[PDB]
Design a protein around this ligand. Sequence first.
Ligand SMILES: O=S(=O)(NC[C@@H]1CCCN1)C(F)(F)F
Ligand SMILES: O=S(=O)(NC[C@@H]1CCCN1)C(F)(F)F
Lengths: 442, 442
Amino acid sequence: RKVLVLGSGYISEPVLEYLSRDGNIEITVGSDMKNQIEQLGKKYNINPVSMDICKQEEKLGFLVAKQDLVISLLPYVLHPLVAKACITNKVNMVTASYITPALKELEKSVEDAGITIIGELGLDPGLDHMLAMESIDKAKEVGATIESYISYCGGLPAPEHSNNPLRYKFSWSPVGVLMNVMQSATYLLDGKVVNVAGGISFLDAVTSMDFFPGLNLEGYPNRDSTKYAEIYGISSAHTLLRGTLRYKGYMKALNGFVKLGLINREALPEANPLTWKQLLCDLVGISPSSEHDVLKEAVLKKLGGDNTQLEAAEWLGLLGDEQVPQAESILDALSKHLVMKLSYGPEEKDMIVMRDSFGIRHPSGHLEHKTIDLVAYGDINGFSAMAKTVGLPTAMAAKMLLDGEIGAKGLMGPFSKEIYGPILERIKAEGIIYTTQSTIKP
Amino acid sequence: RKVLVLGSGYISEPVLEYLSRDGNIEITVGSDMKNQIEQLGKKYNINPVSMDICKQEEKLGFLVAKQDLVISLLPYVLHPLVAKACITNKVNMVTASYITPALKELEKSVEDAGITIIGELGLDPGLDHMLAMESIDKAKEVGATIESYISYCGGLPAPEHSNNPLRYKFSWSPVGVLMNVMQSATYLLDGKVVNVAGGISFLDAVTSMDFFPGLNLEGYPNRDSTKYAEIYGISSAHTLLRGTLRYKGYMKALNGFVKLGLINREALPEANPLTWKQLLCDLVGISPSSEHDVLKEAVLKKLGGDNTQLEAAEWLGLLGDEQVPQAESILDALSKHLVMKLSYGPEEKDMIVMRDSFGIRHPSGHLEHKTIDLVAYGDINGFSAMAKTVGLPTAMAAKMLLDGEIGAKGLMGPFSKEIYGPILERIKAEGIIYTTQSTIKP
Ligand SMILES: O=S(=O)(NC[C@@H]1CCCN1)C(F)(F)F
Ligand SMILES: O=S(=O)(NC[C@@H]1CCCN1)C(F)(F)F
């Protein structure tokens, strides 16, 4: 009855709250942030420990050995360090984010030690694996095969808080999501691989998502959907598509930022602090002076008179005299400013929407078109929908390892019925409900 | 510490739950429905009493005399009967629905008896009066006058349950809302009274409501918005508009039902039960036979090939072989069928959206454009947003009369700060939050 929660804040809160319900468990918390762990310590009964994972690797080995399970809530590049500690000692692990290629190399060492390491847990990845494999196993139970798998997911504000230029509010730093617009998107469609161009042209791949008539959604494909054939075992499927959901207008606003030259990792531009008007004067290539003059330069650069994108930049204060935050690049400076202007206030709900669609060919010959809807809202005096959907699957999988319900050993995701069955059942009690519907087509 | 709740089911549940928190209060319940009061008695500790209000008026007088307050949750035509009982005895009253002209005649008798009767309590009417008068009093505190008052309100499904032809699910019978499409809409706009034609042409008055970009809303005006000048004391205002909110496509689907001849109070049409295909054959004027034949007759009648309206009727089963419910008219038969096909399941959320907009002229000369947003969702293992917004204002006003906080006497709405101030404060704790924002225009 003892666990180490590496990392703190936001994702940790529901993990600590869920584990501390029974009482018979000692929560230890390791963290780099000094102020955050102190604030987290006030809410939940824990043992505060301050440590860097890379620098203080010696004390990690001794601390990890004292526990029954390590819950890593750190960035996914640092999992080889925590896995290196966990394989040496006799101790299990659970991971929120992806299982990287670096962590996949340890699978030989992990199985030899006789321990269980569960990765790919949370919303996405996580619940996407669980809902997919539930349906895929149900199809295999009756001899049926998967012909198509389309799955869209999105974390976004509740409709009442969608009235801004991006129709969005940021939970954490947008450096990743902004850079994903520059990245490509590969997916399979009707036995043909479709590569989509990132950057300026990525707006052309955006489509209207009309599965909820009342909800004004757009969609676009993720970075790589072809990998799910090997993961789920559905290489016979002619269509594999995975995408992200936003409200309509989001990608067009980011397309504005791409035109202006804001989405890049170049450094910032003598004896006076750099304001946003002065930075945009640099990009459009004029002297730092006159606000009505840069308006003419910016609107000219943002296509043939795109007033919507001009107003989006005006609303956020990109043409104003506010100071540019100190940062390593222009993209990092933009990200800090967007976090400042578009964040969730204390009484503002977020939303998690997730929509799957399966084409299932039965042995009879007919095609079942199965759909899954998962929609959750944040609680006012409680956890956000993002925190619950990311936190609870990792927290529940952790409790299942301590109780001794998961008998399997080695490195793995939540793909087996042993893992996904109990989790999907238990998240219903926490207010994460998913419905199902299917129709037959002869 | 004793009250009589006339009427039961849906609206009563949150009223009984709110009043029974402290414990020091005896809940009595009068009702016409025998099965409903028994089911309600299982959940909350009450005294079941079965009675018709009109027929058994003798026992009402004796039962009402035993109580401290009568909470009427009946149809609004029956309030003169309950008011006639309450004025005779020394006892207060609270009312959910409108204060009718018939109830307004008793105001002389009500004041002479030395009692308090609060009407117009709930969502709409109710919270519309409270939010309006809060802003209007705040304007009068700084010498400012109201130039415009626009206020849209709507009870509808949460976006995830909007995928049907009406984008709607009915909480109670739709005979009222369907008949309101046939009724006119009067309102004031820029010092000019605007009368809108009901029926077939009412679709032309429907407008896009874009205050939440993520929410795909339509709006249309209510039956009479000119009366709020006298009620709020804003006769100087050049614009008075009150409307109802739905998801886009709702009024166009009802417009389909108007074209087909379904929205009317004519009676139903020998030795075999009447099906929906046979009823639509009567209306389009063909023999009761062949489903593909009536499809051609119906689509011809529903404008020049309106396939959307044809599919809406097809989806609901209006061209199928299901039996028409027993009813006094075609509209009543349609209403029973729509309740059957489009209702809330146990785990399905509803939504209350409400949006006000004030043009406030200050003594300085400038114009304040103030806006109010109120959005609430139904709880999964709890009350619906409709039940909370309708029930709690009546329940809170009832508690304030028993505690002796409302000192005023006579017949009234919730217009004074004495009533609306404490209620708006207390509904925040129950999960009904409203935000405010304003901008100055020189
Ligand atoms: O960015 S999201 O909308 N969804 C993340 C998923 C997985 C990667 C791309 N789409 C978030 F809000 F959930 F983070
Ligand atoms: O019908 S609604 O959408 N709103 C009622 C208000 C008051 C009368 C017309 N509009 C309801 F769902 F709340 F009942």
